[PDB]
């Protein structure tokens, strides 16, 4: 077999892929926080608007 | 000794396809984040203006 070929392929020169992967993760977390904040704020807008109509 | 030349090229091509996969991912996420954070700002602004409208009525 040749598992060592593929494993060695993935192991050398990986600072790029790992740096890209890290940044990719960070953006998915930021994108999660922004979405929860938009959810939180929209509840507020719903909540506040409901008080005005009274 | 050629089984290694085609295997080194198959690996280099796989990473390139992998990288271009990520870079576009990173490119698309930033543009969605700019659009979300732009959306968040607008809501914070509207939430402040509504709150002000309430406090100005008692
Ligand atoms: Na978006």
Curated annotation (Swiss-Prot), chain A:
Domain bZIP: 1-54
Modification after translation: Phosphorylated.
Top-rank taxon, per record: Eukaryota
Region (Leucine-zipper): 20-48
Chain segments carrying region Basic motif: 1-19
Compartments where found: Nucleus
UniProt note: domains: Binds DNA via bZIP domain; DNA-binding is under control of cellular redox homeostasis (in vitro). To enable DNA binding, the bZIP domain must undergo a conformational rearrangement which requires the reduction of the interchain disulfide bond between FosB and JunD (in vitro). The bZIP domain is able to form homomeric oligomers via formation of interchain disulfide bonds under non-reducing conditions (in vitro). Under reducing conditions, the disulfide-bonded homomeric species dissociates into monomers (in vitro).
Function in brief: Heterodimerizes with proteins of the JUN family to form an AP-1 transcription factor complex, thereby enhancing their DNA binding activity to gene promoters containing an AP-1 consensus sequence 5'-TGA[GC]TCA-3' and enhancing their transcriptional activity. As part of the AP-1 complex, facilitates enhancer selection together with cell-type-specific transcription factors by collaboratively binding to nucleosomal enhancers and recruiting the SWI/SNF (BAF) chromatin remodeling complex to establish accessible chromatin.
Family: Belongs to the bZIP family. Fos subfamily.
SUBUNIT field: Heterodimer; binds to DNA as heterodimer. Component of an AP-1 transcription factor complex; composed of FOS-JUN heterodimers. As part of the AP-1 transcription factor complex, forms heterodimers with JUN, JUNB or JUND, thereby binding to the AP-1 consensus sequence and stimulating transcription. Interacts with the BAF multiprotein chromatin-remodeling complex subunits SMARCB1 and SMARCD1. Interacts with ARID1A and JUN.
Protein name: Protein FosB
Origin species: Homo sapiens (Human)
Residues included from the entire protein: 164 to 217 of 338
UniProtKB/Swiss-Prot annotation, chain B:
Transmembrane segments: none
Compartment list: Nucleus
Record's comment on post-translational modification: Phosphorylated by MAP kinases MAPK8 and MAPK10; phosphorylation is inhibited in the presence of MEN1.
Region (Leucine-zipper): 22-50
Similarity comment: Belongs to the bZIP family. Jun subfamily.
Entry's free-text remark on domains: Binds DNA via bZIP domain; DNA-binding is under control of cellular redox homeostasis (in vitro). To enable DNA binding, the bZIP domain must undergo a conformational rearrangement which requires the reduction of the interchain disulfide bond between FosB and JunD (in vitro).
Subunit structure, as described in the record: Heterodimer; binds DNA as a heterodimer. Component of an AP-1 transcription factor complex composed of JUN-FOS heterodimers. As part of the AP-1 transcription factor complex, forms heterodimers with FOS proteins, thereby binding to the AP-1 consensus sequence and stimulating transcription. Forms heterodimers with FOSB; thereby binding to the AP-1 consensus sequence. Interacts (via MBM motif) with MEN1; this interaction represses transcriptional activation. Interacts with MAPK10; this interaction is inhibited in the presence of MEN1.
Listed name of the protein: Transcription factor JunD
Organism, as annotated: Homo sapiens
Gene for this chain: JUND
First and last residues shown, out of full length: 275 to 332 of 347
